Ligand binder design. Structure first.
Ligand code: URP
Ligand code: ZN
Ligand code: ZN
Ligand code: ZN
Ligand code: ZN
Lengths: 531, 532
């Protein structure tokens, strides 16, 4: 026959279309869309039985264990994360390269990427992955700082196809000044990079943590109290101001604050190139879960402060940054996904064990009496596992339960926009004959009376296919799940089973994003020298 | 051969993708998309030479001559309008059926549509067309009326596939009170119709026109002065408030006011189902063009205007429409609205009256009728511009090529796909879907070519419009691309400047319920409609 694979009787969903058609796949790529394709032309035929077919999900906010250990030891390798991703319908992930301050000169940032690529080249990869670069040390003063930095960004792009840079406005060791952000923006704009910011006011966070500890208020729940949404709002406002002065396109990661969403919306209405990301957890969970409706029935989650009130430390399962917000906030995150505030949705996947206490990758790492650590929220490793649950959670709580407008909005923010904003388009993100990698998800049919033994009813840890010992969504009902995950024209997940023999993932060299060319709009008569 | 038509070497543009691929067409529909299709498989092969291929344009705001003469006599029939559409890359138009106050009972609104369908069934149609229903007489009081109106909308949908209703907040004879709008919203929400509003405060317009005439300020330019942007803003705010109270999806037609755009955006941010339309003229023209004397058209390059003919005091009427073309500095707002999601769709508000003949009932000079106490005052000027032909090329050029729109995808979204979705013609129309889409396609000229194309026009002229009007307001301006092929239901109807009449086979279109116009189910108080 002439094609490797034909998908029949399915409904194709893209960022802008929903329709019944059939797909042929060959040599790792989408080859054809047509009404009906002769089954004898394919080596393998999949009957979708009326189910939706979506592009594979693209999660551009994933944390994996890396050699510099910026977030300490993390339980998931690239092997584990990509396995988990695929079991949950995600077929591309983008992780983070930590700037290595021991490397100097023109190649310093390319050498930072090399550490990661070399490490992951020996692991079994279930899908493709890319890398963002994290920057936390910027040279001073600016006029030099901006010029050698320029050469370094070119080298990172030319050698490894990295075109995105991530910076922090909070966290000791990561927080950089406004002045240094401007220096970076100068370089990124010039090179057409995608500039990413974690926008919380680090000074306010630090002061409030100290004030809480002084009163002995150190339980997990006070992580939220130390940094209310007005702190994320202020910083996001300040960061927009910087981007405006510098005419530099900007993406805010994991937005959770209504105040932040407000200033982001206002900038987008003005036509400034301000992009935003949010995460399932900010729409589905509230901070009531950290101690003892448009989201998850919180009492249905198992192994939480509600079910285990004797365990005072169990709130740590849900500690992340920015914090899961108070009741009443979650609805404005859904509205943000529908109204255009959020360009993409990522997971902020970051995994630390709860049911083992001794390892360096345990949440209980917060207990270290010999290093003046006694379980205070300050010392809790921040993050939740989420790479597997991202796609099904939006399918269910978003599309089926009506919190997202349609399947097309789902695809737009989960698949196509991530590819576009991070320079993986059109190789990834869509279903384009002759062009797209054959990265596809076939779901189960929604309106069927037929029983599918392989379709899960609840989220469990075993279902995650990851290396962590818990998921925060443990025990909750889930109303659909990937029935097939196809990665580069091969079936890698089938009806609850991973097919390791079809794992052929590779590092992905990315291009410059067409969304991140500058507006050419300025506040004053000043222009950068190179203009 | 197995297929009627193959398009090779082109670049496919949809509402969310841009990519090089080839298309096969048979029996009026898109059959196949693939990297490369064997040319021996097609009866006809078109080499696109690297140019973009878009879906055909869908203009859901077109006015044609109709038997009840709501807008007086209009120069274009459905024959003329669809010919003009096709010459400009538009492959579906939606015009308007005037409520016939002489028909009574359950079938009264279906009977209104029948008048139009019957009349156009004898004309040569170059592409498909649908109809919106215009409502200006609502029965009172609301409760007792509910059954009849509800039953009437059902009959209009069941018999003629009409699923949209249009109402006016201005114009004597058309303006309806807030009370009556709520009665209509009650019925339309219940039937999943698309509710359309022209939102200008009619009372403010009426008062200010009388104030201006009292001072003798009657020239065409004072049309704009009689109804500044704050008037469109107020009424748009009022209409949103009504739609909110009634949990009814709403579309605002030809939005031109920054204040209107602002309250529209705020509602969209809240998640209310508020949609909006704008038109090329609100982004490209300013009111300076209505009397003698960088993001729009260079106004001095327009031929046959108050700039070139300052002797002709009435020539400003060529550019009189409602809402008015706005003062300098407003036009940029409209582009931003197209980019940031404020505007769901772009239509033309195509409405044609002759300028170079003065005697007929379809002339602009209709405003001169000494016996009916009419002496050229702006009040008597028939409102409207021809635009159905120029809509797609104007956005291609001044939008995509000149960088006022963000991408070709955004162009397709607002010009083709969203119009189909919001008015229940999707997926039959609006996209390029194998086995599903009517083969309605445009092949442009290649942008980056050094090759000469004798058939590619450099300027907009009246002759190029292929319409029945004797002017276009964009006469004389540079245009940097144009449809090279317009394919309608798998047949070539426009090729390189020539209309192919023998391939004209357009039909009336029965439309469905729009998936965008199901209600949000969100209310201001504990009250719910009886049927829920
Ligand atoms: N307003 C205008 O330009 N023409 C009359 C058509 C209409 O808007 O109903
Ligand atoms: Zn972060
Ligand atoms: Zn993170
Ligand atoms: Zn109107
Ligand atoms: Zn109109």
């Amino acid at each position: 026959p002439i094609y490797d694979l034909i998908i029949k009787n399915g409904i194709i969903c893209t960022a802008s279309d929903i329709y019944a058609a059939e797909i042929a796949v060959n040599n790792g790529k989408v080859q054809l869309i047509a009404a009906s394709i002769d089954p004898s032309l394919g080596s393998e035929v999949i009957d979708a039985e009326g189910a939706f077919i979506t592009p594979g999900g693209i999660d551009a906010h994933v944390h994996v264990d890396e050699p510099l250990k910026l977030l300490g030891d993390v339980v998931d390798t690239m092997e584990h994360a990509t396995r988990s991703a695929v079991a949950g319908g995600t077929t591309t992930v983008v992780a983070f390269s930590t700037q290595d301050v021991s490397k100097k000169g023109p190649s310093a940032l390319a050498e930072s990427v090399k550490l990661d690529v070399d490490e992951y080249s020996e692991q079994t990869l279930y899908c493709d992955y890319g890398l963002h670069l994290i920057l936390f040390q910027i040279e001073k003063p600016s006029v030099e700082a901006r010029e050698l930095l320029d050469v370094q960004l070119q080298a990172a792009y030319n050698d490894y196809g990295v075109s995105s840079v991530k910076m922090f406005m909070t966290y000791p060791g990561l927080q950089i000044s406004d002045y240094d952000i401007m220096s970076a923006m100068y370089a990124t704009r010039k090179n057409g990079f995608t500039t990413m910011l974690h926008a919380e006011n680090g000074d306010m966070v630090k002061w409030m943590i100290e004030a809480l500890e002084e009163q002995g208020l150190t339980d997990a729940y006070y992580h939220g109290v130390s940094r209310p949404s007005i702190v994320e709002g202020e910083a996001t406002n300040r960061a927009i101001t910087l981007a405006t002065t510098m005419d530099t396109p900007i993406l805010f990661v994991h937005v959770s604050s209504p105040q932040a969403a407000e200033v982001i919306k206002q900038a987008q209405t003005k036509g400034l190139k301000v992009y935003a990301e949010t995460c399932p957890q900010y729409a589905l969970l509230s901070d009531a879960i950290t101690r003892c409706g448009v989201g998850i029935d919180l009492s249905s989650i198992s192994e939480s402060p509600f079910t285990n009130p004797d365990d005072r430390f169990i709130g740590s399962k849900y500690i992340c940054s920015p914090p899961i917000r108070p009741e009443g906030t979650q609805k404005s995150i859904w509205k943000g996904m529908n109204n255009g505030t959020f360009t993409i949705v990522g997971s902020d996947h970051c995994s630390y064990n709860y049911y083992e206490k001794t390892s360096t990758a345990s949440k209980h790492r917060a207990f270290d009496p010999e290093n003046n650590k006694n379980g205070e929220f300050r010392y809790i490793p921040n993050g939740l596992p989420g790479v597997c649950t991202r796609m099904p959670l939006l399918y269910d709580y978003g599309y089926l339960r009506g919190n997202l407008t349609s399947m097309m909005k789902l695809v737009e923010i989960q698949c196509t926009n991530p590819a576009k904003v991070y320079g993986m388009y059109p190789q990834k993100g869509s279903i384009l004959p002759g062009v797209s990698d054959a990265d596809l998800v076939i779901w189960y049919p929604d309106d069927s009376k037929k029983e599918y033994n392989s379709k899960p009813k609840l989220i469990t840890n075993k279902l995650m296919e990851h290396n962590c010992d818990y998921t925060p969504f443990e025990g909750i009902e889930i109303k659909n799940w990937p029935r097939y995950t196809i990665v580069k024209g091969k079936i890698v997940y089938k009806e609850g089973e991973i097919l390791k023999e079809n794992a052929d993932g590779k590092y992905l060299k990315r291009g410059k994003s067409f969304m991140c060319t500058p507006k050419n709009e300025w506040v004053t008569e000043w222009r950068p020298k190179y203009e």
